[PDB]
Amino acid sequence: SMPFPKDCSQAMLNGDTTSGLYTIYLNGDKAQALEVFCDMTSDGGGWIVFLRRKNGRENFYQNWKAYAAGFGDRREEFWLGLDNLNKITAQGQYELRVDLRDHGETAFAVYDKFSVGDAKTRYKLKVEGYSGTAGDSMAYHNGRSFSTFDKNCALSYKGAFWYRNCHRVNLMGRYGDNNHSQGVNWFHWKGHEHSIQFAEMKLRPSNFRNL
Numbered sequence: 001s002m003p004f005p006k007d008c009s010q011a012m013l014n015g016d017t018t019s020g021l022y023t024i025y026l027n028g029d030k031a032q033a034l035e036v037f038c039d040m041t042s043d044g045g046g047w048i049v050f051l052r053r054k055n056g057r058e059n060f061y062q063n064w065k066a067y068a069a070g071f072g073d074r075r076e077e078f079w080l081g082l083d084n085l086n087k088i089t090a091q092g093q094y095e096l097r098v099d100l101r102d103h104g105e106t107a108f109a110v111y112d113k114f115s116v117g118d119a120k121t122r123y124k125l126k127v128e129g130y131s132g133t134a135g136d137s138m139a140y141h142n143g144r145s146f147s148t149f150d151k152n153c154a155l156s157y158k159g160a161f162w163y164r165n166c167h168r169v170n171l172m173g174r175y176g177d178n179n180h181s182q183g184v185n186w187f188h189w190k191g192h193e194h195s196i197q198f199a200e201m202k203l204r205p206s207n208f209r210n211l
């Protein structure tokens with residue numbers, strides 16, 4: 001096992017094959033411990049989950065400081081934090097996976113390159129190299145800074161995202177809100193008038209598939 005695994009891929013190779021909460025260490029630094037939920041079953045496992053929507057119990061209409069730091073219950077609905085995502089994606093070449101489920105139907109998207117810039121970039125999104133079944137709805141958002149109501153699409157749709165003008169993905173939107181563009185949307189799967197019941201965003205090294 002590695003003593004200070006830097007992501008859920010190094011924790012899974014540590015023989016931890018049950019999804020749930022693990023400690024990772026940013027940059028393998030014992031002083032940068034972070035509790036994360038690891039999805040160890042989807043497409044080979046080793047995924048840090050960074051967004052989960054499933055029941056509408058948690059409020060996602062939160063401010064810049066909340067989105068930078070993270071909020072929620074890792075075992076239920078949560079957001080891992082932009083500072084965490086920047087530091088993790090800086091450690092190597094990461095891939096994004098999005099899992100969606102709604103009324104028993106499932107879809108997914110993978111982006112072979114995923115990064116989040118630091119605060120001086122307003123946490124700029126990079127997403128490239130699409131595959132999957134959900135439809136490439138993150139392409140619209142590529143290269144955009146993050147937006148909250150206090151730093152306006154976040155205000156107009158009462159959510160937070162790498163908004164443009166405004167969204168094809170709104171996974172931090174209002175739970176169960178089927179009004180146009182208000183809900184948990186993935187446009188090229190279920191459009192703008194269908195809020196998706198279950199959504200996860202997660203990341204792991206792009207080279208995991210053959211390491």
Ligand SMILES: Cc1c(Cl)cccc1NC(=O)[C@@H]1CCCO1
Nearest residue numbers: 069070071072074078079080081
């Ligand atoms: C990342 C995160 C999750 Cl996922 C769950 C609850 C809170 C946070 N954020 C923090 O623990 C830090 C601690 C000081 C301010 O935020």
